[PDB]
Amino acid sequence: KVFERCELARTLKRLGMDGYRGISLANWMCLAKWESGYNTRATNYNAGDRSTDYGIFQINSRYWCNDGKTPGAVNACHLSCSKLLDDNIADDVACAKRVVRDPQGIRAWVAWRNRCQNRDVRQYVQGCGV
Ligand SMILES: [Ca+2]
């Protein structure tokens, strides 16, 4: 599904993401916007290591979720990648929460560092009553 901005905002808030490990909700929204356009079905294949990024957050199959076809795969979220391609984002959220539990935090995603870090992100949540 392609979420609308405020709808995504409220669902993430509901799911406990506002301020998780000090990351505000606007930061998570900015990340989803650049990573998938808010589309739960986004995918990206990385030929270099043969991994694939999945869902709204573009979670990678070599370290996070298991897709049965990525060598070296470590499955830190203990979750099949195919669960990140559906319309319910609660597992995506649980897995993204685990990712930021590592030392890099949200800097794990290069898109966030390039398009979000240090910038004004209030546009992502303006008008959502979040
Ligand atoms: Ca899901």
Describe what this molecule looks like in 3D.
- The protein has 130 residues and is α+β, with helices and mostly antiparallel strands.
- It has a single domain (1-130), classed as Lysozyme (Orthogonal Bundle), CATH 1.10.530.10.
- It is 29% helix and 8% strand.
- The protein has four helices and three strands, in the order H-H-E-E-E-H-H.
- Strands 1-2-3 form a three-stranded antiparallel sheet.
- Strand 1 (43-46) and strand 2 (51-54) form a beta hairpin.
- Helix 1 (5-14) packs across helix 2 (25-36).
- The relative contact order is 0.21.
- Residues 83-84, 86, 88-89, 91-92 line the site of calcium ion.
- It catalyses: Hydrolysis of (1->4)-beta-linkages between N-acetylmuramic acid and N-acetyl-D-glucosamine residues in a peptidoglycan and between N-acetyl-D-glucosamine residues in chitodextrins.
- This is Lysozyme C.
- Its EC number is 3.2.1.17.
- Residues 1-130 form the C-type lysozyme domain.
- Lysozymes have primarily a bacteriolytic function; those in tissues and body fluids are associated with the monocyte-macrophage system and enhance the activity of immunoagents.
